[model samples]
Structures are given as structure tokens and as C-alpha cells.
Target: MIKTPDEIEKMRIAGRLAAEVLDMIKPHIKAGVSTLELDTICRNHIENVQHAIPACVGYFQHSICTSVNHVVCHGIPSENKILKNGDILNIDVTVIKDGYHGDTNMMYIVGGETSILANRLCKVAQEAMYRGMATVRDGSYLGDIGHAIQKYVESERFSVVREYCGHGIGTQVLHYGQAGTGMRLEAGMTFTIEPMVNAGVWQTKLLGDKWTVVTKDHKLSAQYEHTILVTKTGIEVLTARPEEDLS
Candidate 1:
């Protein structure tokens, strides 16, 4: 079902807060900072400053996920995992405001100097997400979004993580997409389009920590996400940041 106008307005606030949390943590993402510290900072801003809840904390007991390099998703925050020069990190965040949820993730290559492949992977992954998002509109099938992402990543010689695709996000509900299911989309329906692209084989493994996901080949992985809204005419990226270099 499409979201009512009032519901869409509330979602806008939720999505903006999620994006703002990422913007607020930019300065703390240095080579010497620990993932745990980043998590604390994000928690402080979300809970106190924004007066919003960090949905991930206590969902599995963490404010955010810091997946570095080979870690695909859900890399638990830990003091042991410190940022370092030339390391690529993915910071995933989710925030709840006015009972709605907003979620997104960003990739960064720490230090001024970085690996070419890592940089390319991040750029391509972000582009792949947008490519998938571009396919979002009324009458578009769920498979179309997945296909757009899959085709672009394969064309770039990267592999898509098969185990995880995008899902629906709501105030008190969540839905996962099944490509080619022919589920006709409708305006006011909101969801996510997080396509995780890996540099090696598409296979993945779950770590003993029960959260972090990594590539089977341990190659670098990159991901980008946005809480997307199915607008009346097309789509809107509710969680987009002003600083994003969407080039």
C-alpha cells in the first residue's frame, strides 16, 4: 500500500535524521579512531541531540555497523577494529523518529592515500545503487530494481551478494523484495535499495559474531543504501545527504 501524505511527511523526518547522523560523524572517521568510538558518537547525537532512537542498538545491541574492507555488512562495533590508513570502511546507520525508520550506509577509504580498487569499488557500488533506484516508479516490478543493480555490477566485473538484497522499511514493519515477483509498486510504498557489491566471488559467509558478513574470497566489498520513497510520479531518495558527491 502507498503511504498516506501524513505518513510520508513523518518518514521525511526519520530519513533526514538518519542521514544527518552520518554527516555528524564525518570528522570522527580518522585513521586512529576505533569503530566503537564512532558508534558512541553516533549514539550520542541520535539519542540526545536529535532526540531520536538508534534503532540498531538493542535491536542486536549496537548503534551502527562498521564494516571495513572485506566485511560486507553488520560488522559489529569493537575497539579492536581501529581505522587505519588506506582502509575502506562502511558506516551503516538507522534512526527512528516519530515512529518511522530511516536507514542508509556510506563507504569511505580512510587516510588521504587509498587503494585504487577500493576506491573504484566504492564508486561503482554507489552508482549501482542509484542505477537500481532509477528503476523505481509506479508499475515497476521489484525484479527491475534488482536487475538494474545486477547488470551494472556484472558489467563492471564485480559480483552482487546474492544472500542479501533490498527490502521494505516501515514504521513498524519490514518487507524483503523478491526479484521478478511481479509485485506492482504503488506510490506511498517505501523501501530500501541496498545492493552490496563484492570484488570477488558472489558467495558470502556469516562470522561467528553473528552479524558481520564477509566475502568468501575475502575480497573488498562496498555498499550504498537509501530509504527510498515511491512517489506519485516517480521516486524520492528520502535519506540523501547534502554533501553527497552524487557524480
Candidate 2:
């Protein structure tokens, strides 16, 4: 479903706030910090500073997903989960305002530096998300977004996680498709373009808690996300950061 002009403007604020949370937490993401600690900071920042709600709290009992290394998506924040040097982390955050949602996440390498393999995986995964978003526009099919990400990830010898694709976001009426090009895109549609690229097979295993998803082979996985709005001419990345340069 397409959003109203006013709703889109509100989403811009929500999206910008979500992106700012990630940016604000950058310095605190180094080694020795617990995932729960980061979660606390973000939750407070959203509720107290930004005057918005953390969308994932009641939905999953956490403010953000602090997935480290092999823990793909939706990893619950825990004090026991401490960041370590050479570990790669994916911090997923969602914020809500005026009952509208803005979702986004980014990959981080713990300790300010990454190993060669971790560096490659992180770079490719982020680029895959860019490839996916580059396919968003009016009159395009959702399959174009998924296929663009799939093609680029495979070209880099990484696999796109099959179990966890991007989804309809904001008000939940919008969506993305992996195949069947019948779903035509239109301006005013808002959705997420998150590609979970893995070092091994695309197969995933859901953890016992039922929220976390991991790679079946236990290989490293990385992901990046952006909430996008289809525009009359192309697509606007509502969650785009000043630091991103896909080139």
C-alpha cells in the first residue's frame, strides 16, 4: 500500500531518528561493551531524547538486535553477549512515531578493525543491500530488488540468506518480493531493503527462542538495511547515512 504525502514526511523523521541512533552508538560499539548495554543506550535515546518508541521492545522483548558473528538476525540483546575483538556485529534498530515505523540496521566490526574475511563479508553484505535498493523505483517489480541483491552477493561468492528477506515496513501494508514479478512498484510505497549475505550456504536455522536466525553451516553472516520510499522518478533512501558510499 502506498502512503500519504503527510505520512511519508513523518516517516522521514522516523527514519532519520533510527539512522541517528545507529550513528550515535558507533563509538560505544567497541570491545568490552555488552550487547545489552548498547540496547539500553538506544532504548533510552529513542524514548527520552528522540521522544519516540523503540518498536522492537514489546514485539521481541528487546530494543535492538545485537547479532554478533554467526548470529544472523534478531539476536536478543543480552548482558552475557560481549563484543570481542575481530567479531562482526549487526545492530538492528526500529523506531516508531505517530504509529508509523522506521526500520534500519548496519553491520559493525568490533574493536574498530576487522579481519580480512570479516572485512570482505561486511563489505559485500553492505554492497548487496545497496544493490537491492538501487533496484527500487516506480514501475519496477519487487523481484528486481531481491534479484539485484542475489546476483551481486553470489558474484562475490557469498550467499543471500533465503529465510530472511526484506519485508513490508512502515505501516506494514508495503512489501518486497523475491520472485514472481507481478507485484508492480509504485511511488509512495515504503519498505525495507535488507540483504543478509552469508559466507556459506543460504540455508538458515531458527534458534530455540524463535526470534534469532542463524546460518545452518555456522559460517559468518552480515547484513545491512535501509527503509526506502519509491519516488516518482526513482527511490529515496530514507535511512541513508552521510557516510555511505557504495562505490
Candidate 3:
């Protein structure tokens, strides 16, 4: 969806608030913390501190989606699921501000050190999302984004998840497609470019709860998401973190 100037300004604030939740939760993600605890912390900050609504709350009764290790996406937060050292976790956050939405997610390693494959999966997944974002512009086709992401991720020997892909901020923005196909992008268009990469097979299995998605092979999976705006000449990563270099 194309956003008006005033709407874009609201999305910018919403995006920053969503990102700020992630930044605020970083110190609380160490080993021994439950994902539900983290979710409550995020919910408090989003409602009380930011004065924004956590979009995922009513959608699933949780403020955030906490996917750990083999969990691919939509991994529901639970009190039973506690963090452990070397676990790779992904926290997906979306906030609604002034009727606009800002969505983003990032990977975190509990207690730091992890297997080489786990670390690499996180690195490649983030870069895959970035590669997809780099293809955005006023005249670029949506397929160009997926083509770039798929090409780069497969080259790195990691598989891209197909069941879930990025979407419009306000249809589907698939993560794998032909370069010249799909709708042409335009300035003021906003969407997310989150690539879910798996160290094992790309096929995912849904849990009994009908929400959590996990790697079929039980191997590691990682992802990164950013809400972005396409410009006439380039793109703007509205949810980018302070340590990131979007250039």
C-alpha cells in the first residue's frame, strides 16, 4: 500500500517504537528467562511507555513471537519455554501507532557463544533480508527483491522458508520469485523484507497449537525483519537499529 506523507510520518514513529521495544528487551534475554516473561516486559513497554498498541496481542494474545532454535516463525511465547545458553532466538514485534503499523524482528543468542552453524545462520539470514531491501526503488519490480534474497541465501547453502514471507505494511511480498515478475514498486510504498533462513530443509511443520512453525528437520533457523519505504531514488529502513549501517 502507498502511504501518504502524514501516514509515512506516523509509520516512522511506529517503526522506531517497535525497534525500541527490541532494544529495551535485549538485556532481559539472557539464559534462564522465560519467553512469556520477555513478552510481558515488551507489552508493558509498548502500552505504558510508548503508548502504542502491540499489534500481535489480540491477534495471538501475546505481545511478541518468540521463536527459538529450530522454531522457524510464529513461535508462540510460553512460560514453559525457558531460554538456555547457546539457544538462538528470534523475537518478532509489531506495533500500531495512529492506525499505522511498524513490524520488525531480530535474532539473539542466549548467553553469547553458539555453534558455528547457528551463528552463521543468523548472519546469513540478516544479510538476506538486507539484500532483499537493497533491491527496493520507485521502478523496481517486487520479484527483484525475492530474486536477490533467494540467490544469495541458497548460495550460502541455507534454505529460505516459503510458508512465510514479508508482506505489505498497511498482499504478500514473497521472498522467492522471478526477478522481472510481480507488481512494480513505487515511492511511498512501505513493506517488510524478512527472510527466514534455515540450516536444514526449508520445509516447516506447524505445531498442534496452530501457531508455532518449526523446521521439519529440527535444525537451526534464523530471521531478521525491517519495515522499509521505497523512495524515488532509494529506500529508507524505518525500523533500522542504531548499530546498523543501511548504506
Candidate 4:
């Protein structure tokens, strides 16, 4: 759906609030911390500090999704799952305010040291998501976004996850497609660009929990996400982080 001018403003507020949750949780993501502990901190911040709704709480019984290492996405927060040195984690955050939603996620390296493959995979995954975001504008096709991402990721010898793709703030915005296909973008459209790149094959396997997704080969994977707004000339990354240089 194309958002109205007023709705866009509301989205901006929601986006910033969602990004702030990530900022607030960074210091507590070190080794020895449990995923449930991290989730609790974010839940309190969302409900108490931000006074916003945690979109994933009731939907999945958690305030956030924490994917660590080979886990691709939707790894439910658990007290049994503890962070450790050299572990890479992805925390997906979605906040709802005044009926609008802001969603985003990013990678975090525990203990500040990891395998060379893990480091490179995280960097490439983030760059791939940015490339996809760069393709958004008033007239570009949705396929252009996925094309840019797939091309770059394949060139780097990494695989893009196919089972799950990005979605419109309200529809499907796949992260893999041929260029010049799919719907033509227009100003006022808001959506997310989240690319999950895997170090091994693109095939994924679901865990017994029915929520956690992992690489079939058990190799490392990484992902980054952002909520974006299409504009007349370019695009605005509504969930851009404070340390990002999107220019």
C-alpha cells in the first residue's frame, strides 16, 4: 500500500524507535549473555521506555528474533541459547506505534573476534542488502533490487537464501528475481530490504521448533535488514543506523 504523507511521517517515527532498540541492546550482546536475557532487555525498552508495541511478541511469543551463527533467521529467543566468543548473531526488531510498523535487523560479532569466513560473510551480506536498497526509486522494478543483490552475492561466491525473501511493509518484496520483472515501484511505497547470505549452499533446513532456519550445510550465514521508503527521485532508509554512511 502507498502510504499517505501523514502516514510516512508516522513511519519515520516508528522506524527511528525500532533502530533505537538495536542501539540500546548492543552493549548487552557480549559472550555469556543468553538470548532470553537480551530479549528481556529489548522487551522492557519497547514497552516501558519506547512505549511502543513489540510486534513479534504475541505473534511468536518473543519480543525479538535472535539468530546466531548458522541460524539464518527466525531463531527464537531462549534461555538455553547463550552467547559465546566468536559467535555472530542477528537480532531482528519490529516495533509497532500508532498502527504503523518499523522493522530492521543487523549482525553482531561476539567477543570482537571470529573466523575470516564469518567476518567476510557478514560484510558481504550487509553490502548485498545495501545494493538492493540502492535500486529503489519511483520507476524501478522490484526485480532490480533482487537482481543487484543476487549478482553481487554470487560474484562473491556466497549464496542468497531463497526460502525466505524480503516483503513489502504489507506485501511480498522478494530478494531474488530477474531484472525488469515484478511490480514497478512508486513514490510513497514503504517496504523492507533484508538479504540473508549464506557461506555454503542456499538450501535451508527448518529445526524441530518450526521457527529456526539453518544452513543445510551448517556453514555460516549473515543478514541485514532495513525499512525503506520509495521517493520521487530516490529512496529514504527509514531504519538507517546512527553509524551508517548511506551516502
Could you give candidate 2's per-residue lDDT for residues 22-140 as a string of tens digits?
99999998889999999999999999999998976434677898998988888898999989989999999999987777899999888778788889999998888887777777888
lDDT of 3 at 139: 97
Q: How close is candidate 1 to the true structure, as a TM-score?
A: 0.94
Q: What is the lDDT for 134 in model 4? A: 85
Deviation of model 1 at 125, angstroms: 0.2
lDDT, candidate 4, residue 48? 95
Where does candidate 1 have its weakest 10-residue lDDT segment?
171-180
lDDT of 1: 0.86
Candidate 4 local lDDT, 1-247, one digit each (tens) = 7999889988998899999998889999898999999999999999999999997643378899999999999989999999999999999999988888899999999998999999999999999998998888999999998899999999999999985457889327475779998899999999998999999999999999887999999999899999999999989988988888786
List the candidate 4 regions with Cα displacement exceeding 4 Å.
Answer: 57-59
Give per-model TM-scores. 0.94, 0.94, 0.97, 0.97
Per-candidate clash tally: 3, 0, 0, 0
Assess the local accuracy of residue 57 in candidate 1 as a C-alpha lDDT between 0 and 100: 46
Per-residue lDDT of 113-228 in model 1, one digit per residue for the tens? 68888888998999999988888888777777877888889899999988656888875222234555557788888998899999999999998867678999999999989999
Backbone clashes in model 2, listed as residue pairs: none
Q: Which of 2 and 4 is ahead in TM-score?
A: 4
Q: Each candidate's lDDT (Cα)? A: 0.86, 0.85, 0.90, 0.90
